Amino acid sequence: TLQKKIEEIAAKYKHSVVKKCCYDGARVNNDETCEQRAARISLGPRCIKAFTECCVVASQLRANISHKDMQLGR
Amino acid sequence: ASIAQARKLVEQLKMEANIDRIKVSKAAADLMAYCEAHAKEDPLLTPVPASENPFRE
Amino acid sequence: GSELDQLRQEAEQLKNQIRDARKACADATLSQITNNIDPVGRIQMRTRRTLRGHLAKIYAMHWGTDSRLLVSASQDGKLIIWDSYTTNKVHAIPLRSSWVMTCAYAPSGNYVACGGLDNICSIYNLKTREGNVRVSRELAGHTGYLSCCRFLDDNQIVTSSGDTTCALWDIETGQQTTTFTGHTGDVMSLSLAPDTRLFVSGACDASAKLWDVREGMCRQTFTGHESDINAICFFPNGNAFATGSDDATCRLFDLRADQELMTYSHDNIICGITSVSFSKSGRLLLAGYDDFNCNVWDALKADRAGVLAGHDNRVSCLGVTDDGMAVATGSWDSFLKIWN
Amino acid sequence: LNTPVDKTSNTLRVPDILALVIFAVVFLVGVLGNALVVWVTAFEAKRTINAIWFLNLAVADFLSCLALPILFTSIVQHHHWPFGGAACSILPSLILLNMYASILLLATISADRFLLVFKPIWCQNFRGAGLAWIACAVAWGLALLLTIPSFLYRVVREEYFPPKVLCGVDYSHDKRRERAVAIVRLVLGFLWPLLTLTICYTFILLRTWSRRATRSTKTLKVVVAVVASFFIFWLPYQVTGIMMSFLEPSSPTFLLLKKLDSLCVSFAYINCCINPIIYVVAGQGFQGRLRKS
Amino acid sequence: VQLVESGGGLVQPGGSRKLSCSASGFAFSSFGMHWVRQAPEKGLEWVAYISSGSGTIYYADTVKGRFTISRDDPKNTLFLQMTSLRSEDTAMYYCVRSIYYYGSSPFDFWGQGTTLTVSSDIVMTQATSSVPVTPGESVSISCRSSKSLLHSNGNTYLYWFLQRPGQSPQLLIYRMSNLASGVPDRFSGSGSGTAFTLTISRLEAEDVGVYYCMQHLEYPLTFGAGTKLEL
Amino acid sequence: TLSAEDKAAVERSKMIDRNLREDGEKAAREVKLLLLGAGESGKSTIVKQMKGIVETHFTFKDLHFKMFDVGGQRSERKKWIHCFEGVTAIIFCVALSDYDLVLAEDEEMNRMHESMKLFDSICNNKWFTDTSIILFLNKKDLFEEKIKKSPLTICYPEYAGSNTYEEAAAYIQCQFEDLNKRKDTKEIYTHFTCATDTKNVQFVFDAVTDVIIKNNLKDCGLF
């Protein structure tokens, strides 16, 4: 139900840029945390908050999934 | 026993030199004539058509 | 003694007289006379059927008179009858002795003969009411290995052995009717005339001899080789024959004139000759060598016209059918091949 | 807008380029090598008993090499699975089956050589061509019995940002089953064959060098090459596949190990390309046998 | 050489029974075996065939599903099991050898017969049913079929055999041109396409009997109606 | 396409092929040995102990042997030796009590030189490049009584030694084993036996076991 909850969060948007920021926050980048990734964002002063909220929401639900992405060679 | 063997050898040499001999040219001509006459029925000299070859695959 | 010396001198004088008489009748050569004839076109032959089933070297192979059936002998203890048209096996005869060097197929089609390294020639009957193949006769009168055996009819056989002597047998009785002697070495091959009235024998002393079946003595002796003689066969006319030796050389000898006509040898050939055969018309001469391939020679102009190369080991047996349509070759690779 | 507000990208790291290069070289050489090996071996399977041992190994190596382009494409597309549901539960199992067959066949060949050097009298009386086929059948059956968990526990999952589908393994929160599977797959896949190879070959070497008539230096070279290749080219895969197996999906060590999986897999497949070479090099008259047919 | 068969008694309209045949004098393992059924005061028809090695077994359509064939090579005995018997399965059964290779002569021995009483296909036509004859004059018998018996290999599969009164059939001619073994040179065969002629030059006291022509292109094997010859 | 008889012919051919394969698989489980000598070298005692052309069969420790004796041939050896190209081993017999005897044909030429030249011809043949040779030296007892009356300087005029049973035997063995010209492909075994012995069969068993092991190693490509 990650899609439904992300859409619910994005439904509180005001501009298309906010929706784009929230979609960007949902990415599955693993090396860095959402707070550190926010440091690279400077285009929008109000993009930071939506990005942080969306990424923090996504990361918590991505845990406890029991699925492992084993490669085709194993 | 040596004398008997020598007698047999000399008798064989007597009997081996009392036959008629012909010319080499006549024998060569006869061989060529036989080959020329019988060349028409040699399936190996000329490849026969595949229709009449029992060994066709 | 003086008598022995004078007899040797007389023998030498007779040899000189024979040589002079042979030189007297030599007026021309075939090479000059055959210069004008058209050369034979370069010949390609292809392997049609391959025969498998043996498990050792193959030493003997003889065609039938119907040009469809053949017999093969190997040192695995089996004698196999093959149908060439469909590549089938009719009979597999087990042998008491596994050291075979020759085999023969009866002209009628009722008997098959084998033997080797046991001084015994065994005759096997193929047509039996009981439904199997049984031993009909075991001829044992030789003191050496049997090199070649050929049929004259259903109740006669001629045999050559390593005891320098040749024999003529009667199957029903089992006794030597005639014995041929006069060689100074082992006997390897013999050839029967189409008229069933002459046969030649070739020995390891570089000598060929002509014999009569009836009378039982020698008419002509041919020399000129330099090593052992391993194969011999008649021209289809019956007035000449071809000899193959271990000195990488074949020769053609005439019977009407006791002389040598032509020799076949090449610089690149340094190996021996194991089999010699002719064609139906007498124009092609087939030779098998130890260099794993067979050669075709023009019997008149002495030029090579083709090479058959499909065997991985030494070529041991070569045969040509009575109708002159296919050529059968065997080797120590345990495979027969039919070439057309 | 594909470019995010963040400056992060989705480029491929150097290990992936190395893995792709290794995959290409292994495929290109091994396909041809195994094709020639199979063609030469299938002709002699009627007469020679040794041939049918190498025939199965060559077949397995050929199939493994043929299954390489799929893995090559799966890396460029960032692990996307377009085939569907049933393929995700079938194809990896066959890929693993080829591997396990190619290992157990080598183990059985080593055992056959040991039983042929020691006790030759029994092998001259009661050894033929059917026993080898029975042994090969047992090897393939053991491989299938070991690979059935791949059939059992493979599923698909869908991620929406970006839209993609992944083939993976789910145990539904059961650590005991996963750990047991890992132990059984390690003990019967790596340790036992390695022990069999080393013990049998040391015994063969000692007995061969005991007497003068059988003593030669080629045996040492062949044995050392085979054993060293096996050990070196299979250790990293197994150690990675067990460490990742006992660890949690969220830890710095797990992320470190996830960066070097394809490299280990390619490093392991180089053995499937190495194996055909020893047969040609350490054989007598391979050129003549190829010229025969 | 001799084949002796037994096991034949009287059975009720419903029941089962087995027949046995034992051979002595030849290699049994290298010969295929045939069963032939002859109705009382009628012709004879084929029943079953078993090949060497027990690899190929052939049955007739009129008896398919009811009869079983089996072979014992170590004991040299051929069995036949009758499972369900109608009222039409009352006849006398023969046993025939057969061998097949290049130049063979199948259907060479017939042995004796055993009696049993109960309380697509190529048609073979012989128009003649009786021939009065005086010894010393030539006789010709004609046989025709529905399909040409000539094959692409050049062989024609026609067989001529004879039956004396109170005796078993004996082979005379195979492949319409080859004279069998143990028979005089008086007999001859010829023909072409679908027409076949069997000619006897000189007739003696032992040539009286019934004559049959047989085909061998395809299974089942079909016989023709007998052409009786009377003195 | 085939008629009803062609199928039966093919079935007969297949059965023949099966029988031939079954017989060939059984004929390969036998050890083959070729026994040579110099006429009076002691073949009879060897055969009596370990039991045209003569064939002998015996069995030791579940191993089946097959020995071929061709001493009664009396023909040219070069025309039929190649038949024995795939024999497991050659058993050579030498009677070393013939260092003083002389041949009947010539009083100048002795028997031991004939044995040595025959061994040289057999060992360096083109068909026996990788064939093992087992050399039995026979009847050493008569040698040990005869050596004291007459020395072995008659045969070899370049020998200087203690003239005892051990030195002469060692010299003879060294002379025989030095005719080999391969030293790598071919291995030669030597043994001393008398009329009453029971350990010759074990010797030949060990030799053939070594040859079998080497052949199996070569067949697998590991040699």
Numbering used by the authors:
A (entry chain E): 1 to 74
B (entry chain C): 7 to 63
C (entry chain B): 1 to 340
D (entry chain D): 22 to 314
E (entry chain S): 2 to 120, 136 to 247
F (entry chain A): 4 to 54, 183 to 354
Paper excerpt:
The 74-amino-acid complement fragment C5a, which is a key proinflammatory mediator and an anaphylatoxin, is generated during the complement cascade by the cleavage of C5.4 C5a binds to the C5a receptor (C5aR) 1, a prototypical member of the G protein-coupled receptor (GPCR) superfamily, leading to recruitment of the G protein subtypes Gi, Gq, and G16 and β-arrestins and, ultimately, to numerous cell-specific responses including chemotaxis, phagocytosis, and cytokine release. The complement fragment C5a is one of its important effector components and exerts diverse physiological functions through activation of the C5a receptor 1 (C5aR1) and associated downstream G protein and β-arrestin signaling pathways. Here, we present cryo-electron microscopy structures of the activated wild-type C5aR1–Gi protein complex bound to each of the following: C5a, the hexapeptidic agonist C5apep, and the G protein-biased agonist BM213. Moreover, combined with mutagenesis studies and cell-based pharmacological assays, we deciphered a framework for biased signaling using different peptide analogs and provided insight into the activation mechanism of C5aR1 by solving the structure of C5aR1I116A mutant–Gi signaling activation complex induced by C089, which exerts antagonism on wild-type C5aR1.
Human C5a is composed of four α-helix bundles (residues 1–64) and a C-terminal tail (residues 65–74). To understand the mechanism of C5aR1 signal induction in response to C5a or C5apep, we first determined the cryo-EM structures of active C5aR1–Gi protein complex bound to either C5a or C5apep at resolutions of 2.9 Å or 3.2 Å, respectively. Unlike the two-site binding mode (sites 1 and 2) of C5a with C5aR1 predicted from previous mutagenesis studies, the cryo-EM structure of the C5a–C5aR1 signaling complex reveals a three-site binding mode. Compared to the apo structure of C5a,23 receptor-bound C5a exhibits substantial conformational changes: first, helix 3 (H3) spins in an antiparallel orientation with H2, resulting in the exposure of a positively charged H2–H4 cavity that induces extensive electrostatic interactions and van der Waals forces with the membrane-proximal N-terminal region of C5aR1 (termed “site 1”). Third, a novel binding site (“site 3”) where the C5aR1 extracellular loop (ECL) 2 region occupies the C5a cavity, which previously accommodated the apo-state C-terminal tail, and packs with H1 and H2 of C5a, thereby further stabilizing the activation of major complement components.
